[PDB]
Amino acid sequence: LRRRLKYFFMSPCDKFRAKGRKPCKLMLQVVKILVVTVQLILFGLSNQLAVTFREENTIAFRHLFLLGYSDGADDTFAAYTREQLYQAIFHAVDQYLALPDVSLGRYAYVRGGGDPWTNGSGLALCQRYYHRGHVDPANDTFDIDPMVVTDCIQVDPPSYKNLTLKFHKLVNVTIHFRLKTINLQSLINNEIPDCYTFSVLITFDNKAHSGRIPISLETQAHIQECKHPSVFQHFRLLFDVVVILTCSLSFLLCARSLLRGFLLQNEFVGFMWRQLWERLEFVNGWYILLVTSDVLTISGTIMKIGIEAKNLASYDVCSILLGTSTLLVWVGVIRYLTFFHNYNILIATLRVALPSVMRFCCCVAVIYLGYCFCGWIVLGPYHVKFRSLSMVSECLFSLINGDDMFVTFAAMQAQQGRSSLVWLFSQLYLYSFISLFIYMVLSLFIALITGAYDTIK
Amino acid sequence: LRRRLKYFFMSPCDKFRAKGRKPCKLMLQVVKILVVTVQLILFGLSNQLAVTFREENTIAFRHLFLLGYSDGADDTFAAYTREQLYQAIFHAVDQYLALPDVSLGRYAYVRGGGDPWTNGSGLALCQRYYHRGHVDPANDTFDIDPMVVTDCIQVDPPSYKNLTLKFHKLVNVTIHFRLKTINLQSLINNEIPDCYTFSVLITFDNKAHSGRIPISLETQAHIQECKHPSVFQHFRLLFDVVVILTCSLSFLLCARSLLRGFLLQNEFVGFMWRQLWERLEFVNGWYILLVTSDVLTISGTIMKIGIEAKNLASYDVCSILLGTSTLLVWVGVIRYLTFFHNYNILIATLRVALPSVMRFCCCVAVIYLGYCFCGWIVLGPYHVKFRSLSMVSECLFSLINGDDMFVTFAAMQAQQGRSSLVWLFSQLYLYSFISLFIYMVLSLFIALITGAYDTIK
Amino acid sequence: LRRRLKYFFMSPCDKFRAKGRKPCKLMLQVVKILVVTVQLILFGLSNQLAVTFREENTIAFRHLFLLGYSDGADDTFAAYTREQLYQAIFHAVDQYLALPDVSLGRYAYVRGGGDPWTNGSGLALCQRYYHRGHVDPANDTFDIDPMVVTDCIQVDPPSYKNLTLKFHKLVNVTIHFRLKTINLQSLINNEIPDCYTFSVLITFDNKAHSGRIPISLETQAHIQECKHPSVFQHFRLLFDVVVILTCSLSFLLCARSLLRGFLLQNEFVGFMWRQLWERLEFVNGWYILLVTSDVLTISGTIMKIGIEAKNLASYDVCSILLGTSTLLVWVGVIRYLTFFHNYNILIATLRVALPSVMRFCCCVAVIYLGYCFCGWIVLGPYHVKFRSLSMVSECLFSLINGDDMFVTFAAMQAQQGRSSLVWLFSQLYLYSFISLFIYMVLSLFIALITGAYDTIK
Amino acid sequence: LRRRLKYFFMSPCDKFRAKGRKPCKLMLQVVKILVVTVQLILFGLSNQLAVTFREENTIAFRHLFLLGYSDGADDTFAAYTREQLYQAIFHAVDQYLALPDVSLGRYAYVRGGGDPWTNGSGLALCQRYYHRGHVDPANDTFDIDPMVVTDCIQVDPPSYKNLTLKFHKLVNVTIHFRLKTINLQSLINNEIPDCYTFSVLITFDNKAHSGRIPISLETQAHIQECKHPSVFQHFRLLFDVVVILTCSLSFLLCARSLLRGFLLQNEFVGFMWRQLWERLEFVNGWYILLVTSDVLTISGTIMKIGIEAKNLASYDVCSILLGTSTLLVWVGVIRYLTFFHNYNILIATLRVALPSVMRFCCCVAVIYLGYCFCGWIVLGPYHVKFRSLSMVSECLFSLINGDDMFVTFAAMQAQQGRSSLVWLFSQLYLYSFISLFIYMVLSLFIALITGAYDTIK
Numbered sequence A, B, C, D: 001l002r003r004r005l006k007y008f009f010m011s012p013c014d015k016f017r018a019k020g021r022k023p024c025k026l027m028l029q030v031v032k033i034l035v036v037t038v039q040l041i042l043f044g045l046s047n048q049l050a051v052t053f054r055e056e057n058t059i060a061f062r063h064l065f066l067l068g069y070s071d072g073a074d075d076t077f078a079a080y081t082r083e084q085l086y087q088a089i090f091h092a093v094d095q096y097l098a099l100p101d102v103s104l105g106r107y108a109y110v111r112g113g114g115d116p117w118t119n120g121s122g123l124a125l126c127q128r129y130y131h132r133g134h135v136d137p138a139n140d141t142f143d144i145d146p147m148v149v150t151d152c153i154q155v156d157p158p159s160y161k162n163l164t165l166k167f168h169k170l171v172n173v174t175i176h177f178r179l180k181t182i183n184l185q186s187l188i189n190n191e192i193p194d195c196y197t198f199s200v201l202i203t204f205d206n207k208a209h210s211g212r213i214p215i216s217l218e219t220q221a222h223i224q225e226c227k228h229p230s231v232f233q234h235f236r237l238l239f240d241v242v243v244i245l246t247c248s249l250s251f252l253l254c255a256r257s258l259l260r261g262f263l264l265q266n267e268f269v270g271f272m273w274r275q276l277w278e279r280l281e282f283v284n285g286w287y288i289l290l291v292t293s294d295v296l297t298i299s300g301t302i303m304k305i306g307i308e309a310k311n312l313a314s315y316d317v318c319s320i321l322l323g324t325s326t327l328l329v330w331v332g333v334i335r336y337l338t339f340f341h342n343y344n345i346l347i348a349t350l351r352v353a354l355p356s357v358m359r360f361c362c363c364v365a366v367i368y369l370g371y372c373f374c375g376w377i378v379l380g381p382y383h384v385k386f387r388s389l390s391m392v393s394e395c396l397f398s399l400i401n402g403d404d405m406f407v408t409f410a411a412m413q414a415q416q417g418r419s420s421l422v423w424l425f426s427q428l429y430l431y432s433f434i435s436l437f438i439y440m441v442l443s444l445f446i447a448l449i450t451g452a453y454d455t456i457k
């Protein structure tokens, strides 16, 4: 029994010496690294083609439909006079009607199909305003029924010029239309082009009632298989099957090893009773990682095959699955470096250090969250880097690492004249956070890890 | 007596075991964290609405009244010819007169009400120049009486075109006017809109007499309750009361604990005399922090209620109070981690290290201040990052942390041709500061903290 | 024998004391540092002249031939309407035909000389499109033969206006032409000007078929000697010969030393057998470095002479050879600091630490590569810093060093609305990578080096 | 003798206890810190006024005389066609002639006064070209006499339109003129305005002969006292005298202390002989620093008085003297913290560590310089951050500190297509430099300092 456990815990070379066992699993891991990385790279081509088609079409739409638009102006693009707003709206509608004659792309119109379009209508131009909107700042008076009324004008693809905006109670103006196009660039990857429908929404937003109306354009892309396409004189499937077989064999071997470990546990524990933390010692966490990676790889490969067959179109989910599986496959080879101490410094140190690090983070996290909430709410209206909670966390994390510090300070220098109290608070907030976290918290965080290393050294 | 002191210093779990005491204060702290964070987030909505209204109106005013203005040009926007300046002034006045017909916002005019406006006047266009201003660079001569004379033209809302600027002795030109508007976006937060008055000042500044006249626009916003408003078919107050009650109960419990500690002190010291630094051992600093946080939270909640009732308008002060109270409430929960050593590394290390750190900072601060003053005065005229003392401190602090270094060096590369001696001095200054502070000062600063940790380790 | 080995391992001062040997090699190294650095600086003048000529001519071509081009617009310069594309093409051809009258440079035309130009033709205007290109997005249909057909129009330097683009199946449009000019600025370096031929390619790229056609201009420069030039009344060669002689003498002395060491080895090993890692102890690695540097310097000097004689034009290869040789020559002087322990801390520490560092990197590299591949494929379509594998490695390496962190986070904030799953994955990816590598991997990497120093301390 | 030496080395408090000595020098140092800092701040006002006048006038000149100039375009502003160049030249001359009618500043013309102006001429328009310039790229031929001929046209302030540029052999075109103005803003500081003469040089540079001619404007400012000015109804001098007296008293006390120390040395050494590194122990380096600071302060104060009296105009030298003296005065107070060990950690550590640090830097410097030269010459033509040696040193120093790393990598990504070999070399260069210096050199540099601290700890 003692000899059996010893052999169970021996290294692949020692196991080969003791029983001549061929290290099949190691060769499988090397082959898996190769094939999974290749498959990820090959999938990247189709992924990139889809993403590029979407983004480039959207940029072209911005240049076609937004009057006076230039690259890099998305965040500030806005209208400031009634004349500017009317011109922008009419320019968008006119360009929609002129598209077949001016555009470099080839687009088809879409009519009807439910709200906001009536049957036969390609473009919907809608204004939304308050039901009752009497506003009299001269008398410091107003009478509002804030229920929103929508008024929509329908334009058929080849009377909207009579649009009259109710500026004083206007909530917003929207233009909705759909365009069909074909992603021909797929031919360069030896793939059949897909049929895209772009749903285009142009928003003139007046919700702030501030005299400035921002203008934006957004698109939603829907992918379909085209109807009986034809490519003249048009292997991924075999490689996908090879990946699936390699991952399945690895999964079966890992499951066999895990079952063997479970049986050896049961045996040893039963013997020890007749003569939980110690039970989780026959469990090889590396093999749990390997089976997880195999499951992820197989799921991603199935999804990739489905997308290639045009049954699915979820490029992002497939890419995440395959990328995570590739990372885990690369990481999993470290198991075979754990037997040699000279190569196991990182994992040994991590195993020793993680408990104390988690206990330390328990106390650090409340301070971090307090700072996050305070910054988000107090400074967010004034500081571009504090607009949302996740943005605040990114800014604070970068500050801890010494990044983007002066610009963070400088963003507040504009408020020194306007809001002096806010500026002073921001000084105290930033200086105290940086000092406490860089010089005290991070110091001890690193000291715990280096002390663990000194222990395992 | 010894048993009583021991119990006084026992942990909540130990106190429960010894007397069955229910840990009411801990549950109160958890509830306070939840409710105070929620209240801060809820206040953030109104705060953001107010700040956004102000900023967006100001941006719209810049686009409406400044001829040829574009976003991002505020720091360099200026006139360079007499024709440009006249056109800018007349454009601003004409736009003020045309506002009801062109603006996307709804504004009302304000007349009279003291200087600089006469009764019935909406806009004041004033030029300020020297009383006597004979300037003759051809003969290297001048005769100046630098007393400032103001000449103001009054424009009523719907002869200023005859303005004649005295360019050679002109000090500046200002345009003052006020506009009234209503912040309707508040309806989205189920709040009654407020009435805003924007005081708008446009400055054409010639104080440098350098041939370049910068142009700027600034606004001051004053908030009022509107006169008998009406919102059709229009709980925060209950939640505020809940926060106040929770904080009041916590305050009373903390005051009771502090009184008990004071009595136990008095007893022990009296006994020790019959048989200051040691006296400050029954004082629970965590409870001082808790009572401070409770006072801040109650004050901020009262201010928030007042603002909601429209008796107050100090959003910034309220936001600072509530944000600081939220941070302190989050921090104060660390008290309950202090009993367990494995979770108390940060606080134990800080308690051991702070005295030596303060002694070290005593010596470091004089060097830091010397560098601050030298940089501010010598380099400030030439370097964008050294314009003011606070900006100099921000730049030096960021340099110590390794941030924004190359751009700091590169800002001076332009002067290498013009002012070579200044460039050389800047090289010496920056290199010496960075070397001394990053490699010597900060090293020992961190070494003190890690040595304290080694002590408490 | 023992005395002979001792002397072999003695320092230059000790060898001088023992035998009066004059330290010729040390003086040679000092002289080499001086002369090699001077030669590199002198070569830099010609290198800079060539590079500047190429880049400035290319910038001028962009301003001359690209309609509406401005500096800094290269990455976004594009056409969006048929009218814009036609205007850009015709503007380029018209400017080519007008060049002798408008350009500030002096250019000569090149005719014929093979494809894509026919004999006598200076400019080739070619459009490439699919052989059969029926595209019908209205019916979700298409019939494509993706074989590319090229149609070229030839323009002689002083009917292209009849160009009809097949927009629906257009692959791209290219304009090719060559221009000859003379790099006169070489006169300032007392050199004979060379004759440059610039091959200019303007691309209007429609491979994405996205409605946006990017426009780019590229140049290839070919340098020739001009035919019987004449500079009125027009030493580098002697200095090059001096460098060659110094390096040759150093090489011969180092080869002599290496032979002596090899003989001493052979002797000692033969004696030890009658009475491999120990064999690599008579090998002076510093002298291997010195001979490598001498070979590189001689090769670079020969190349430099050839370029000066106008037999060669490979400035980049010569610059790399001479720069690397200069770096190695500067480094090689450290050999003489190795005898004194107080000056040998760096090399002693490196010698002790390198093996453990390499073993540690063995395990770190698989994790790094996994992250590289995952980021490149999953995030590359969405993140400007993840476009290519080398770019991904640069971004991750910079993140490990705490650089450019917040902007890396912020590039993904745009996708939070569009692609929420990708944004969440990017959050997990970046946070996990930064935490693991900055706080755990780099910590132990530094700890190995400092422990080696503690050993040799 | 032993008692006398002991007293000589006692602290100020101990000396007061032993002899009742009043610590006059300490109070003098505090007073000096106050007064010197105040004087520096007060001088900053005049310094800022002068610098601002110069810079603002130059910006106005750029906007007035450069056709189509915009802020931020200085580095790329250039002409590309003959028509553009002619228009720019004629616009500059026309604006010079129209200045009295259009400019917002008040300027007087300057005539004659030597080259390049003839008597009575205000503006010189000069073109420089080769004496003989036959250039024939069609035949790959040229005949050049590179002697430069200058042809100058003189314009009197209120035939230059007949200018004919020799484009094929043109070296450059320059416009020279001088303008007089008065710095009136000095009145705000209660100072008499000075008379400025701006010498303005506009350069159209064709030295590259590349088809792109950069255009630049530069100014030289000369300050004079105006002739019998007059300011109606117009103390720094007393404060300057106070600073001088304080510094003189401090200097005398320090000289007395140094003489006493020298006498005590002489005595002790003579006694030790009858019964050099040890000799430099009675020398108080703090007092050498104090006397140096006093000399600098007195020199700067005298210069400041001279500038106020308008005998001098060297603002930069005065500012450097006063700023350095302020920094040294702040630093010198640390002497009184050296007696208490708890406050002397920094100085004790520095004294222990400096010798080993210097020995380490001896070896590091050759590697650093090798990298500097290699980068400057190989990468400088391709990389904006490697243009000059000082720029290269700034970039490498910033990289060592982890700053601006990704942008340094990204600047080379453009050359990956064009110059692949240079891109590969840049990869090797940057990666090797960063790894070696951040992880190995800086590690040991910090380790030496922390080990010294451990010694004095």
Ligand SMILES: CCCCCCCC(=O)OC[C@H](COP(=O)(O)O[C@@H]1[C@H](O)[C@H](OP(=O)(O)O)[C@@H](O)[C@H](OP(=O)(O)O)[C@H]1O)OC(=O)CCCCCCC
Pocket: A007, A008, A010, A012, A015, A019, A021, A022, A023, A024, A025, A026, A249, A253, A256, A257
């Ligand atoms: C009785 C259980 C059910 C039947 C099991 C039958 C055998 C089976 O399944 O695998 C055997 C090996 C396993 O290969 P592999 O898993 O690498 O081999 C095992 C591991 O080396 C394990 O150590 P760790 O890796 O550290 O856990 C060790 O303890 C086992 O010793 P032991 O055998 O004495 O218990 C080995 O058998 O793999 C093949 O021989 C490939 C077969 C396919 C080749 C062609 C593919 C196209």
Ligand SMILES: CN(C)S(=O)(=O)c1ccc(S(=O)(=O)N2C[C@](C)(C3CCN(c4ccc(Cl)cc4F)CC3)c3ccccc32)cc1
Pocket: A361, A362, A364, A365, A366, A368, A369, A393, A397, A400, A437, A438, A441, A442, A445, C427, C428, C431, C435, C439
């Ligand atoms: C090591 N130094 C930096 S430190 O200064 O010592 C230190 C130590 C610990 C803590 S922490 O415990 O507060 N915490 C905070 C944080 C930065 C989080 C990690 C989760 N993120 C997250 C993002 C998106 C989503 Cl959707 C959900 C999330 F949860 C948000 C950031 C982090 C990273 C790694 C280890 C601990 C911690 C702070 C500072």
Ligand SMILES: CN(C)S(=O)(=O)c1ccc(S(=O)(=O)N2C[C@](C)(C3CCN(c4ccc(Cl)cc4F)CC3)c3ccccc32)cc1
Pocket: A427, A428, A431, A435, A439, B361, B362, B364, B365, B366, B368, B369, B393, B397, B400, B437, B438, B441, B442, B445
């Ligand atoms: C730890 N390293 C950085 S260090 O290099 O070791 C080191 C150590 C100590 C000192 S310091 O004692 O001079 N001092 C300087 C400073 C950066 C101040 C803090 C107050 N700020 C402030 C801002 C606005 C207002 Cl209205 C008022 C103010 F007062 C201005 C900056 C700081 C922060 C934390 C601890 C000490 C110090 C320098 C470097």
Ligand SMILES: CN(C)S(=O)(=O)c1ccc(S(=O)(=O)N2C[C@](C)(C3CCN(c4ccc(Cl)cc4F)CC3)c3ccccc32)cc1
Pocket: C361, C362, C364, C365, C366, C368, C369, C393, C397, C400, C437, C438, C441, C442, C445, D427, D431, D435, D439
């Ligand atoms: C020390 N820290 C940063 S660390 O976090 O501890 C750590 C330690 C080791 C590794 S690593 O072993 O993966 N590796 C990764 C890398 C950053 C490479 C070096 C080669 N480059 C390369 C570039 C172009 C070409 Cl054409 C070919 C190439 F090969 C790409 C980057 C590196 C540099 C130095 C030592 C080791 C390593 C990672 C992190």
Ligand SMILES: CCCCCCCCCCCCCCCC
Pocket: C365, C368, C369, C372, C388, C389, C390, C391, C393
């Ligand atoms: C040994 C550790 C891993 C080092 C490899 C990291 C990636 C290196 C960059 C990729 C090579 C250049 C390919 C061209 C990219 C366009």
Ligand SMILES: CCCCCCCC
Pocket: A284, A285, A286, A289, A338, A347, A351
């Ligand atoms: C991923 C590691 C799981 C096992 C813990 C470490 C022991 C080899």
Ligand SMILES: CCCCCCCC
Pocket: B284, B285, B286, B289, B338, B347, B351
């Ligand atoms: C905020 C902490 C106050 C008490 C000092 C630390 C002892 C638990």
Ligand SMILES: CCCCCCCC
Pocket: C284, C285, C286, C289, C338, C347, C351
């Ligand atoms: C470049 C160093 C080669 C020799 C190894 C170090 C021993 C002096």
Ligand SMILES: CCCCCCCC
Pocket: D284, D285, D286, D289, D338, D347, D351
């Ligand atoms: C500037 C310090 C000079 C004296 C050396 C340190 C001993 C107090």
Ligand SMILES: CCCCC
Pocket: A298, A299, A300, A302, A303
């Ligand atoms: C094994 C599950 C596959 C889902 C795509």
